[PDB]
Amino acid sequence: HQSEVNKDLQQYWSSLNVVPGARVLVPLCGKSQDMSWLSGQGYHVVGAELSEAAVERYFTERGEQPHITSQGDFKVYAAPGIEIWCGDFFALTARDIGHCAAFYDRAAMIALPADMRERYVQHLEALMPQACSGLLITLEYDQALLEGPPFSVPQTWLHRVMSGNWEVTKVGGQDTLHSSARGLKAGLERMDEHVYVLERV
């Protein structure tokens, strides 16, 4: 129970104590522990898994069963248990689903450049809810072993751009390889994991 689910995540949340049943969005954050945590608490875990090969792995491991959709070059595999559509994320209106609650954001913009980053955060906060607690999970170390080289997006930058719709705050740190799942997924065995608490106002 809550073995390795972003100490910060389980922390902030543990404290936050969002509404029981609030809408929890999972923008290209779809991991397992994060969501498994939210659910374990009793929240509306609805997000997408920006991972094609992943969806495939799920279809091969399960052998079909859930709602598989073909979204262009991406897929959408939703389950009856959770509202996680493995594939791509860009047709669930994080705003409609968001509304009020929170959303776990996984290092995604760090995989892109600045310009794109600004367009990403903005695009998110744009399609974001009205009152939800968002938590971004970035990284630094990982870059030459982890899936996609993270630009260790600087909190300052986030507060420079990602500042204007959500209260982003510096959080997290390094020496947390066990915590970060992606670390055990890619195999960092030691990487700095950055975190930023963004309160979607």
Swiss-Prot record:
UniProt entry tagged with the keyword Transmembrane: no
UniProt keyword Transferase, yes or no: yes
One GO term of the biological process aspect: response to metal ion
Reactions accelerated catalytically: S-adenosyl-L-methionine + a thiopurine = S-adenosyl-L-homocysteine + a thiopurine S-methylether
Subcellular localization, as worded in the UniProt entry: Cytoplasm
Disulfide bond sites: none
Keywords in alphabetical order: Cytoplasm, Methyltransferase, S-adenosyl-L-methionine, Tellurium resistance, Transferase
Superkingdom per UniProt: Bacteria
Location, primary (coarse class): cytoplasm
EC numbers on record: 2.1.1.67
One of the record's GO molecular function terms: thiopurine S-methyltransferase activity
Class of this enzyme: transferase
Residues at which S-adenosyl-L-methionine binds: 28, 49, 106
Gene Ontology CC: one annotated term: cytoplasm
InterPro entries: SAM-dependent_MTases_sf, Thiopur_S-MeTfrase_Se/Te_detox, Thiopurine_S-MeTrfase, TPMT
Family note: Belongs to the class I-like SAM-binding methyltransferase superfamily. TPMT family.
Function: Involved in the biological cycling of tellurium and selenium. Tellurium resistance (Ter) mechanism.
Protein name per the record: Thiopurine S-methyltransferase
Lineage: Bacteria, Pseudomonadati, Pseudomonadota, Gammaproteobacteria, Pseudomonadales
